[PDB]
Amino acid sequence: FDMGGYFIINGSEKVLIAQERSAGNIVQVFKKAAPSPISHVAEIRSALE
Amino acid sequence: YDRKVPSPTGEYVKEPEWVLETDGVNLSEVMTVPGIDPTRIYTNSFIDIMEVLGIEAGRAALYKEVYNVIASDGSYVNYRHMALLVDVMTTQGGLTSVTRHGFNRSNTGALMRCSFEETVEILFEAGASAELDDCRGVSENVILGQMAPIGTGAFDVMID
Amino acid sequence: ASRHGQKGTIGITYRREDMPFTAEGIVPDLIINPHAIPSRMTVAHLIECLLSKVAALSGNEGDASPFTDITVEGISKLLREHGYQSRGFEVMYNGHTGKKLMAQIFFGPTYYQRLRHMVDDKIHARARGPMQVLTRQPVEGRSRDGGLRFGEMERDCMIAHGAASFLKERLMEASDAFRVHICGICGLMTVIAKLN
Amino acid sequence: MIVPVRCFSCGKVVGDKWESYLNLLQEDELDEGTALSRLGLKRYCCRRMILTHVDLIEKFLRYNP
Amino acid sequence: SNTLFDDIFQVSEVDPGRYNKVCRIEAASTTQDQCKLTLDINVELFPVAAQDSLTVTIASSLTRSWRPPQAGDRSLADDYDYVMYGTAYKFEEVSKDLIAVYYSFGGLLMRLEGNYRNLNNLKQENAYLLIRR
Amino acid sequence: SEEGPQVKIREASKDNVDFILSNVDLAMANSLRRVMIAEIPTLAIDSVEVETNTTVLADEFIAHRLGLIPLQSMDIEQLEYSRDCFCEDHCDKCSVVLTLQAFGESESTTNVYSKDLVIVSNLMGRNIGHPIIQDKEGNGVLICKLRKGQELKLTCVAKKGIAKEHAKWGPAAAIEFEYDPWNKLKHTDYWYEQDSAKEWPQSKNCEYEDPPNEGDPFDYKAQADTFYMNVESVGSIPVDQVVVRGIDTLQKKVASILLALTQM
Amino acid sequence: RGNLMGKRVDFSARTVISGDPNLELDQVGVPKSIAKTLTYPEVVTPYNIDRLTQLVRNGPNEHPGAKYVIRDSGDRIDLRYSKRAGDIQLQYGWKVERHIMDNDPVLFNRQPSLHKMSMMAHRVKVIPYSTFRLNLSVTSPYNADFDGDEMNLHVPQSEETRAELSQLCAVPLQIVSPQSNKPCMGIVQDTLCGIRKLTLRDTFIELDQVLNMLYWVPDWDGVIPTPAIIKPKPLWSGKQILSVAIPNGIHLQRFDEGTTLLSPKDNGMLIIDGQIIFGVVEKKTVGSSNGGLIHVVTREKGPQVCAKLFGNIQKVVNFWLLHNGFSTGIGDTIADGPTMREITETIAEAKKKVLDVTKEAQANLLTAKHGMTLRESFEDNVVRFLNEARDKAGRLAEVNLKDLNNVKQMVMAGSKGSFINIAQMSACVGQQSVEGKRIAFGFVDRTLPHFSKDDYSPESKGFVENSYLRGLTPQEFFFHAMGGREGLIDTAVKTAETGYIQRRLVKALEDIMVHYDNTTRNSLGNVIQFIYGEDGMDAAHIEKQSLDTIGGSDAAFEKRYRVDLLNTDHTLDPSLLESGSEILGDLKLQVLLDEEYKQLVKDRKFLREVFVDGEANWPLPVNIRRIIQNAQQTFHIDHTKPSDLTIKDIVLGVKDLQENLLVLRGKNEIIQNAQRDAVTLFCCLLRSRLATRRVLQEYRLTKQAFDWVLSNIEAQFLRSVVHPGEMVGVLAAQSIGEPATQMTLKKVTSGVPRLKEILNVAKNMKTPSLTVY
Amino acid sequence: MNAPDRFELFLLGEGESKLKIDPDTKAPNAVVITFEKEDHTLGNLIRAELLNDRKVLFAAYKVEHPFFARFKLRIQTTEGYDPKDALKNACNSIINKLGALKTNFETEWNLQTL
Amino acid sequence: FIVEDDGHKELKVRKGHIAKLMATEYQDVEEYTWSSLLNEGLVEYIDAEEEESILIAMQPEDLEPAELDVDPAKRIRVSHHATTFTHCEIHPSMILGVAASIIPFPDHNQSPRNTYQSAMGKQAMGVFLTNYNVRMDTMANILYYPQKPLGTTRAMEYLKFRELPAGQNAIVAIACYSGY
Amino acid sequence: TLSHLRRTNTPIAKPRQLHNTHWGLVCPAETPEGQACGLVKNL
RNA sequence: UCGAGAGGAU
Ligand SMILES: [Mg+2]
Ligand SMILES: [Zn+2]
Ligand SMILES: [Zn+2]
Ligand SMILES: [Zn+2]
């Protein structure tokens, strides 16, 4: 009934936890605040796959 | 707004009155307008009332806005508790805030002041400005581990 | 606790005689209180007690799957086939007296979970125990025979009471009263400690 | 993990009916409701001892030490 | 230390006020037209149908513990099938030459309205009520 | 026949006894089932010394199981409490030693039934210490299971005790108890949605009482004198002597009050 | 703030809590191992040496015993292992650290410590088991539950320290709270559920149960009360037996919805001299409320009688409820077959009222309301339309809940229940809300991928038609889960902000205490208030009572107060006063009544200037209403005999009394003016009730009784005065931080966001407005 | 851990008596009997049988704490009637019913055939 | 699931494919597994971005055409008012976690209560593994006599909760009794 | 043990609230309380 | 001793 999916370091079984992040390489439009010199931004997070 | 108001017979009866409600605030140009009562107009911005109608008009405007917070949740607190808090903010002449760059910039000792926030930075300036502490504060005697002037400690006890 | 956020510690252990009984001699393993039902709105707890009760008598499994077309009225048709009240009530008798209880009792099996919080694993008491090295204060945690914090959040409460001598006791005689000597000219503890 | 000797709620000895109960379903091709009624278990306090029991001892035997 | 009030009443209305073993009774004095009463009764012991006629009495006796009857030697002062013990909480006047007396027989409430009980029904704690068939 | 409570047995067996307890007070019926369940003395295992345990189960798991095994307790009055007797730890006048040995010498799964319990101490000629077998196959109670290569060696000491101290000394399982199945006494207020009569099942004991007439008023000042009971027994004591020793244990419990009143 | 303002301390303890009905209020359950661990240094005297020598001989391993013994040298003696642990001669002056024993003063804590009433003293009652036991009624000043909560305990080590717990920090003293000027402890959940079922008029008890109920009251006199019914079966009402708990000298009057003096609904409460006259006991009578039983008894008889009263109500009603029994089934949620028909009809007719509005909006026939957009008017309408379906269908169910319904009975007694929970469990749970609006279009133009795009219907926006009984659909399950996440966020967000708010308030006002001149000050000496609370009275001994000078017609005010000796028609009738006929005319006495009447007229103008709304019900330090009822019963006054008071006795007597009510005691006029300014509203109450017409006609007092009322009012006043030394700002902080902690749930900033704006004075506010008259 | 040894429900401890009798204060003929190591099994049968005796004014028991096994009994009798004698006849009135029950059941059981 | 035209909009998976799926479950000869469902084009892998453009069905009976008396006790399910389907949900209970699928009747509950249990079902006691006797780990608590619950989720079988439970079917009477 | 291996973390404009997009992939109910509610989710 | 995670409480 053990399911696996864990490493065994120093006898203490460890689980790599999932890590949420925004997707890279997408164009997103972000309305800036009213006390701001710039009004709109188009952000693209650029990193190689 | 419904409102009870005295009848000529003397018993209170409800006289309905039309009351405008706005989205913005400028007292200096709104109360000086024909067709309104400039003696009873109200904002929920006590900071505007303090600079326009005098400080002591802001004190009652401060307390009423605290009351509407409590009574919206249905609760009830006695008058003296909030009115103590309002008077402490109001006594200094402006609107002393209950925050780290508010009341805590007073002359109320140093060990009392160092116990709230910006702890080490206050002792630095007191080491420069050579402050002397009265040690009548509660937190001065708590830090020094003495019987503070707290009820029981307000008076000395001696024999006949 | 149960499977519906219904927690609760054990208030008392009663024996079988002191426990109320029904006309079949059945006795509740566990007694909860009806006021924890309407505040948190755990109706599934109430249907689980019903669906388990029909499952025990019929010998068939209980389908508690979400988004089923199983109804309370459909379950309560089955429990009336097995000679009980449709909504789970049972005439129960007091154990101390034997008089029939004036309110008929909601009775049935319900899956309960024994959580990992045990009292003797949390029992902690201390007087004049170990001291921390740096601050001469009591050490942390019950695992080291430590002392409870008389925090500043609690110091305000004793201030409001006006108990001043208790405040000096809780901060000196307990936890790190220390004597030191200072000079009358320079107000600092520079002076060589000379006692005997 | 193994058959309780007595029912928790009433104390009837249910620790003997286990070997019979399993063979009632298999050798007689019965259902569980008629199996518990045959074994003298009639109160539902008794019935949830045998019906809800997961005999985990059979998995414990397979460990050779 | 004797009988204070006696009359004969015909019940007008019996009202179970969301209750199972208590009804709100409504009656007026026969042979009179300026006296009526409203009383709470236990219907479980004494069933009071509507338009029945019931002799009603109020005493002052017949402090210390209530011992059980223990025998027939302790002789009851009731040739009735129903009795109660209560307390007068207020007396009000409907008008001049008129009066109304309020009793609470352990939550069971009675209202007695009339004129001529002026020689009795004082403010003291002790009060009874006797009701015949 | 004797003046007082009257009993009419409707049904009886080795394990179940169904009777009507006519013309008794309420507190006598309730103090009966309270003293039936708990205060009857009965023998079961109270000490276990384990020699070898190669089983998967922990010893105190098995030590808990051995306590609940029903042992014969007919001539239990001839046995004495260990706290009463003068022996060092235990003796034959107070305690009954048991012995269990089992080894897995079979490729198949080897069970450890209760009938494999064997007795070491001297019985002194009484019906004491024999584990009850009601199994149709005769194998008593499944204590543990063994694979090949596993053994279990322990010594059980059966002492005399009262079910208040621990439920292992339980003579009876569950006692049926009903009075006034029509609720002519109005001792409870029925919960209902539309109709109290159609939402609640009639008891079987409803047949043995007069059905009330709703035109008749409430029969007040009647009290509960007739009771309906059914006693199961585990098997350590026969059913007839569960209630009789229950009556005697209660009557002896009343008697110790009398002797205490005289001594003062 | 982690090692000096608060430090870890020895002589402390910690475990779980559990509730014990057969414990007293101020008693605390302490396990033996805790008492075996905790000590108290006790010096040997001639009085205690016979006990202490036995305690040392008893030993530390089993209690009552001692763990250490201290000689005059100061070298400690370990009793756990020493030769002379059984051979001790206790010379005088030696210190023996004994165990904690029964009836010792110790602190009782609960974190978070939001209250002065969250750290109260307790009497030790050593119990065998491992949990701290505490009374039912002490939950609310700690916010205690028994779902695995834990509580601390501290032990004093000196006699002054022991005195401060018993005489300042005790449970009975903190029953009435300066916060909310009301009691904080009341009857909870089982007594409260039982005391209504006990007090029903159908509820009658036989003799056998009654005698057990009588002996359950500890301080009982031994007198069986004469039964309510005696002829067919001697039967007692629940009101009969419950009234034995209430002490003699207690009067209580309360009126609500259908309250005549016959009370056909059994509502309201009338209590006279420790007997209840009619009513149903419930939360408004016995809960920790303003003007309740706990408020009366703590004022009238003292704290210790009311603390003993807390157990005595519990021990009776729990005994009744134990033998009566109570449960909750799922049939307590089932409504009628026909009721479910009209409820889903009520949903349907409101479902079509959205479709008619939506089709009206789709053809641009919508009229834009002023100030708001065309879309916002559509959202405001449909949310309001569907809540009216949810509120009506729930109120359709509460109509159908029968009197035996156990969910209804908790709502009826106020133990644990509400209407909305009935609406969600039986009728319709309603519509879920995220960020103040309906379920947003997280997916493009739809809420879930199972709907077509641009669906502004109720189903595709968050409305949950089915109830918790009927069962939520898959789409409804997610939206209900979606709104629930905001609540668990909102519950977790506010408590960190509230805990910051309370700490900011305490450290702002920590130096605030009443000094020895009733002037609120700080360490520097800067005066904040000249009279604390602007009248100089502790908030504890303060009750709400109406000043009926304010209300009523001038003519109706006249008839109740105008006495014209010169007139024959408006004069004290000689039935009222022995001197009634000799007083008529008498020009020297009508000038006193006219002086009285001119001040009561001036008083009515004064309060009407301040109390513009006209609500006279305002809290004032002395309950005169309860004082007059005492004089009506202590002196057995009839309403027929004339008074012994001439008019000169009343009018000169009241005017002399106001000089004797004291707040400040200075010998200069500006203090005496402040003293006159301090009591001014109370005298306006005092003269209104001690008026010459009202004294002689409305409650016909005598000269002997009248002089006692003047002695009562003066003494109760001087009791109800702030004690110099009370740190009031720390109390003022916690009295607002704790109700802030219970703040949780037509767009304005309200509650904790608004409170965060007020304290941390906001340059830009999120919703400013002008209220224009 | 902290729980007492389970035989204290029915074994008298060190220096404990079974019945301790004390007269009631502010009551003419009343007494308080502290039954030790007993519970509702015994006390209700005493109290319900005292109520059958027509010379008893008051008879009731209470358990001060479900932790411990003890109960207090209070009896009130007519003048010249020690309630101990009212207690003694009541307990003796119980056993006559119990002994009659024992022989009535044994008679009816041996009549039955299984 | 995958829906296309036929003769109308209907699911691709039929009862013939279902019987061969349960034929594989009997054998525990041309085995049929989940990959065979995926490679026969009857099931698609749809993520959050791609499900923006699809119309899913809650139940496979929404596809059946419509044309009265009904049981009043059941839930009120709205007629879907949609026709152009592309997919269908496998089962709506498959939105739940491993811990939330333990809970009986979560659709008949308040959603904070479903969350509150899911945090402390992890701290219930039971048998975590059959080799508790073999393993020597830092801390372990095992229930004596664990019982499978009388009320089981349909998704309990794939979580093996019946095969490795964590509690006992206690006989629970809700009762105001002695106030403890 | 089964519910640890499907646990997520979000190291930190309304993230903690349940999104419509979470349908089918993340459990709506299973999450901790207090410290990081909605940041730590289960699949 | 410092830093990290995990729950328990409101
Ligand atoms: Mg809690
Ligand atoms: Zn120096
Ligand atoms: Zn059973
Ligand atoms: Zn022996």
* Distance, Å, D1 CA → K10 C1': 38
Q: Tell if the CB–CB gap between E65 and H57 is shorter than 8 Å.
A: yes
Per-residue flag: J1 CB under 7 A of strand K = no
Per-residue flag: J8 CB under 7 A of strand K = no
Nearest to G394, CA basis, from G285, G307, G467, G499: G467
CA dist B138 and C164 (Å) reads 10
The dotted CATH code for H1-114 is 3.30.1360.10
Domain that holds residue F161: 42-167
Bases of chain K with protein Cβ within 7 A: 1, 6-10
CA dist F43 and F75 (Å) reads 10
CA dist G115 and G514 (Å) reads 19
Per-residue flag: G72 CB under 7 A of strand K = no
Cβ burial of G618 (10 Å; 0-12, 13-18, 19+) is middle
Inter-chain contacts counted by CB atoms under 8 A, chains D and I: 44
Q: Which of residues 138-157 of C touch strand K (CB under 7 A)?
A: 139
Chains C and B touch each other (3 or more Cβ pairs < 8 A): yes
| DSSP, res C171 | I
- Taking CA–CA distances from C89, the nearest residue in chain G reads G329
* Distance, Å, G760 CA → K9 C1': 29
CB C87 within 8 Å of CB G407: no
Among candidate residues F126, F147, F167, the one where a domain is terminated: F167
Q: What is the bridge-based pairing of β-strands F41-53 and E53-58?
A: unpaired
DSSP letter for each residue of F199-232:
HSPPPGGGGGSPPPPTTS---TT-----EEEEEE
CB F170 within 8 Å of CB F70: no
CB G768 within 8 Å of CB B26: no
* Distance, Å, G469 CA → K9 C1': 31
In residues, how long is chain H?
Answer: 114
Beta strands in G174-318 (DSSP E): 176-177, 182-183, 204-205, 236-237, 251-254, 269-272, 275-279
Residue J23, CB-side half-sphere exposure with 13 Å CA sphere: 27
Measured CA to C1', the nucleotide nearest J35 is K7
CA distance J23 to chain G (A): 8
Distance between Cα F122 and ligand 4 center (Å): 12
**Which CATH architecture does the domain made up of D1-65 adopt?**
Orthogonal Bundle (1.10)
Nearest to G474, CA basis, from G446, G451, G440, G443: G451
Mutate which: H82, H102, H106, vs F, most F CBs within 10 A: H102
CB G766 within 8 Å of CB G512: no
Write the secondary structure of chain I as one string of H (helix), E (strand) and C (coil).
Answer: CEEECCCCCEECCCHHHHHHHHHHHHCCCCCCCHHHHHHCCCCCCCCCCHHHHCCCCCCCCCCCCCCCCCCCCCCCCCCCCCCCCCECCCCHHHHCCCCHHHCCCHHHCCHHHHHHHHHHCCCECCCCCHHHCCCCCCCCCCCCCCECCCEECHHHHHHCCCCCCCCEEEEEEECCCCCC
- Give strand pairing partners of F112: F144
Per-residue flag: G112 CB under 7 A of strand K = yes
CA dist D62 and I130 (Å) reads 10
**Domains in chain E: boundaries:** 1-133
**Domains in chain D: boundaries:** 1-65
Inter-chain contacts counted by CB atoms under 8 A, chains C and F: 64
* Beta-carbon neighbours within 5 Å of ion ligand 3: D 7, 10, 12, 45-46
CB G207 within 8 Å of CB G233: no
CA dist I10 and I62 (Å) reads 10
CA dist J14 and J29 (Å) reads 17
CB I162 within 8 Å of CB D52: no
* Distance, Å, G138 CA → K7 C1': 28
Ligand closest to C27 (CA) is: 3
Q: Is I136 on the interface with D (CB under 8 A)?
A: no
Give helix G303-324 / helix G207-216 axis angle, nearest 10°: 150
Nearest to C17, CA basis, from E72, F134, I176, F34: F34
CA dist G192 and G314 (Å) reads 9
Omega cis (within 30) before G64: yes
Q: How many domains does chain F have?
A: 2
In residues, how long is chain E?
Answer: 133
CA dist G185 and G172 (Å) reads 10
- Give strand pairing partners of F177: F229
Domain that holds residue G229: 190-324
Identify residues of H whose CB sits under 8 angstroms from chain G CBs: 1-4, 24, 26-27, 30, 47-48, 51, 57-62, 64-67, 72, 74
- CATH number of the domain bearing residue G242: 1.10.274.100
Q: Is D25 helix (H, G, I), strand (E, B) or coil?
A: helix
Domain that holds residue C195: 131-196
Nearest to F92, CA basis, from F75, F73, F79: F79
CB C19 within 8 Å of CB I133: no
Per-residue flag: C6 CB under 7 A of strand K = no
Inter-chain contacts counted by CB atoms under 8 A, chains F and H: 120
Chains G and B touch each other (3 or more Cβ pairs < 8 A): yes
Distance between Cα C26 and ligand 3 center (Å): 7
| Chain G residues within 8 A of E21 when measuring between CB atoms | 202, 204
- Taking CA–CA distances from C81, the nearest residue in chain F reads F201
Per-residue flag: G466 CB under 7 A of strand K = no
Alpha helices in chain B (DSSP H): 27-30, 46-52, 55-72, 79-91, 119-129, 138-144
At residue G762, φ and ψ (nearest 5 deg) are -95, 120
Interface of F with H in 77-116 (CB under 8 A): 83
With a CB cutoff of 8 Å and minimum separation 6, the contacts of G656 are: none
CB I136 within 8 Å of CB I176: no
- CATH number of the domain bearing residue F85: 2.170.120.12
Per-residue flag: G145 CB under 7 A of strand K = yes
Q: What angle do CA F151, F157, F161 make, to 5 degrees?
A: 140
Interface of E with F in 21-80 (CB under 8 A): 44-45, 47
Measured CA to C1', the nucleotide nearest J32 is K7
Nearest to G152, CA basis, from C118, H4, B142, C153: C153
CA distances from E46 to E21, E49, F220, G232, G233 (A): 10, 10, 10, 8, 11
CB G545 within 8 Å of CB G624: yes
* Distance, Å, C188 CA → K3 C1': 35
| Chain H residues within 8 A of F31 when measuring between CB atoms | 41-42, 44-45
Measured CA to C1', the nucleotide nearest I120 is K7
Experimental method: X-ray
CA dist D35 and D41 (Å) reads 9
Residue G424, CB-side half-sphere exposure with 13 Å CA sphere: 23
Beta strands in C19-165 (DSSP E): 21-22, 30-32, 62-63, 89-90, 92-93, 105-112, 124-126, 148-150
Q: Is J22 on the interface with A (CB under 8 A)?
A: no
Alpha helices in chain C (DSSP H): 43-58, 72-81, 152-161, 164-168
- What is the spatial order of strands in the sheet that G269-272 belongs to? G251-254, G269-272, G275-279
| Chain J residues within 8 A of I100 when measuring between CB atoms | 27-30
Exposed e or buried b for every residue in G229-255, given b needs 16+ CB within 10 A? Answer: bbbeebbbbbbbbbbbbbbebbbbebe
Q: Tell if the CB–CB gap between E68 and H55 is shorter than 8 Å.
A: no
| Chain E residues within 8 A of F219 when measuring between CB atoms | none
CA distances from F21 to F39, F186, H48 (A): 21, 20, 18
Give helix H40-50 / helix H83-111 axis angle, nearest 10°: 110
CA dist I152 and C62 (Å) reads 6
- Taking CA–CA distances from F219, the nearest residue in chain E reads E45
Alpha carbon distance, N-terminus to C-terminus of chain D:
18
| Calculated CA dihedral for residues G225, G228, G230, G234, nearest 10 degrees | -70
Measured CA to C1', the nucleotide nearest G114 is K10
Chain CA centroid to CA A46, Å: 13
**Which CATH architecture does the domain made up of E1-133 adopt?**
Beta Barrel (2.40)
Q: Tell if the CB–CB gap between H40 and C12 is shorter than 8 Å.
A: no
